[PDB]
Amino acid sequence: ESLFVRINAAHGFSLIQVDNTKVTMKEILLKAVKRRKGSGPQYRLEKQSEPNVAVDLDSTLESQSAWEFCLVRENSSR
Amino acid sequence: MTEYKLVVVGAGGVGKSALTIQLIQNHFVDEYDPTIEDSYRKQVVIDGETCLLDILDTAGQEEYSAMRDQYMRTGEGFLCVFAINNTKSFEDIHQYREQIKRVKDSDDVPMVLVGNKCDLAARTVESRQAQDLARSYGIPYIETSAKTRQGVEDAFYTLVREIRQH
Ligand SMILES: Nc1nc2c(ncn2[C@@H]2O[C@H](COP(=O)(O)OP(=O)(O)NP(=O)(O)O)[C@@H](O)[C@H]2O)c(=O)[nH]1
Numbered sequence: 521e522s523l524f525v526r527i528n529a530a531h532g533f534s535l536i537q538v539d540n541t542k543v544t545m546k547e548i549l550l551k552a553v554k555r556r557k558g559s560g561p562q563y564r565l566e567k568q569s570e571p572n573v574a575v576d577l578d579s580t581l582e583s584q585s586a587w588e589f590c591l592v593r594e595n596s597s598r
Numbered sequence: 599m600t601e602y603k604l605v606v607v608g609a610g611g612v613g614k615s616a617l618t619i620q621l622i623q624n625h626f627v628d629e630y631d632p633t634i635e636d637s638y639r640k641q642v643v644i645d646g647e648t649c650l651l652d653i654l655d656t657a658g659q660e661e662y663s664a665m666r667d668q669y670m671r672t673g674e675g676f677l678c679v680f681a682i683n684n685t686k687s688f689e690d691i692h693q694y695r696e697q698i699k700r701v702k703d704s705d706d707v708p709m710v711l712v713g714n715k716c717d718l719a720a721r722t723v724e725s726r727q728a729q730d731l732a733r734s735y736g737i738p739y740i741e742t743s744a745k746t747r748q749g750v751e752d753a754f755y756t757l758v759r760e761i762r763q764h
């Protein structure tokens with residue numbers, strides 16, 4: 521199996537394949553939004569264990585020390 | 599309200615994700631992005647009665663086959679999807695049914711045999727062969743196109759009707 525990250529969203533979850541942990545959280549967010557929402561409302565990612573705080577999208581997956589995140593509309597909460 | 603856990607299974611590339619997204623979002627996915635696993639929840643009206651569909655879109659890639667056990671245990675109805683231009687995907691249907699049996703102790707679960715990509719002119723799985731397979735299982739056969747939307751609601755809504763009529 522490949523490595524992958526679990527993204528919990530408003531209407532379900534998505535498992536997002538990653539080649540390595542040097543992928544940025546921005547890349548993961550973009551993949552999750554494109555799959556789940558299609559083609560403007562903005563989104564953040566949150567660590568599963570830290571509600572209401574946006575992860576730095578320019579940081580790497582490795583830096584998060586987490587493999588589960590919530591995808592949250594910026595005008596909303598998880 | 600009442601929620602139905604429906605699971606879409608079948609070989610890689612047969613159109614499981616395209617079927618799911620055409621149902622949920624009324625949009626055809628042209629790209630082939632292999633699934634690991636994804637769920638989608640949507641409120642729908644079926645025969646005048648509102649319910650919540652919880653659709654689990656699964657991997658056709660055999661490297662994720664270990665995942666089947668978890669989702670086959672809790673899945674409440676299954677779309678067993680092959681592509682009408684892929685005889686191997688038709689051969690593969692039985693494996694999914696057998697695995698659903700090892701965890702449910704029976705195949706006594708709502709299931710629909712789905713022949714997808716029926717918009718394509720070139721067919722290598724005969725309609726009578728798919729009809730006969732479905733008959734051998736005692737389940738409906740529905741031809742679908744995720745691209746045109748043909749048969750998509752029928753396929754998913756048939757599972758909900760079968761659950762409601764248990
Ligand atoms: N013409 C046509 N193409 C389809 C249909 N359904 C899916 N496809 C195409 O077939 C390719 C694979 O579809 P996809 O939904 O990703 O298949 P899948 O079963 O989810 N693959 P995986 O098991 O890897 O997740 C895509 O390019 C998609 O556009 C259909 O009904 N008609």
Ligand SMILES: [Mg+2]
Nearest residue numbers: 614615632633
């Ligand atoms: Mg898929």
